[PDB]
Amino acid sequence: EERMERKRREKIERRQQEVETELKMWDPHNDPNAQGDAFKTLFVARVNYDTTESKLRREFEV
Amino acid sequence: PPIDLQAPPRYLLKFEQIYLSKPTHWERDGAPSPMMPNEARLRNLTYSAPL
């Protein structure tokens, strides 16, 4: 009953600390992959893995 | 030739350069769509791009 809560607390704190280390090491804004104006760029997810680059062009150039 | 008007106030209204998009089609919501050439054939649309 208590050892489980202890393991949940440790894994949660361990992750939170890894979160602080990742935020300090990696900078989202300073990303080479990211380019262009942020208000211009768009984000699309749940895309099928078979979608060819040309297929995504023909669908988002419209 | 640019068009000049007189009412005095005078206007120039000169054209500079053209930009031609690709074939696009809008529904009621305003969604542009890529008209398959087949889609234009099927829906009796016109394969044209806005200028």
Q: Report how this structure was experimentally obtained.
A: cryo-EM
What phi and psi, each to the nearest 5 degrees, are found at residue B10? -135, 140
Bridge partner residues of B26 (DSSP): B32
Nearest-neighbour CA in chain A from B26: distance (Å): 10
Interface contact B22-A61, CB threshold 8 A: yes
Burial of B8 (0-12, 13-18, 19+ CB in 10 A): exposed
Q: Give the contacts of B47 (CB within 8 A, at least 6 positions apart).
A: B23, B35, B37, B40
How far the first Cα of chain A sits from its last, in Å, is 57
| B1 to chain A, closest Cα gap in Å | 33
Instruction: Return contacts of A51-60, CB within 8 angstroms, 24+ apart.
Output: A58/B34, A59/B34
* Helix and strand numbers, DSSP H then E, in chain B: 1, 4
State the burial class of residue B35 (Cβ atoms within 10 Å of its Cβ: 0-12, 13-18, 19+): buried
Residue of A nearest to B49 (CA): A62
What are the backbone angles phi and psi of residue B43, rounded to the nearest 5°?
-90, 10
A interface with B, Cβ–Cβ < 8 A, is 58-59, 61-62
Element at B6 (helix H, strand E): strand B5-6
List residues bridging with B6 in a β-sheet: B10
Rounded Cα gap, residues A12 and A18, in angstroms: 10
Please report which helix (H) or strand (E) contains residue B33, including its range: strand B32-33
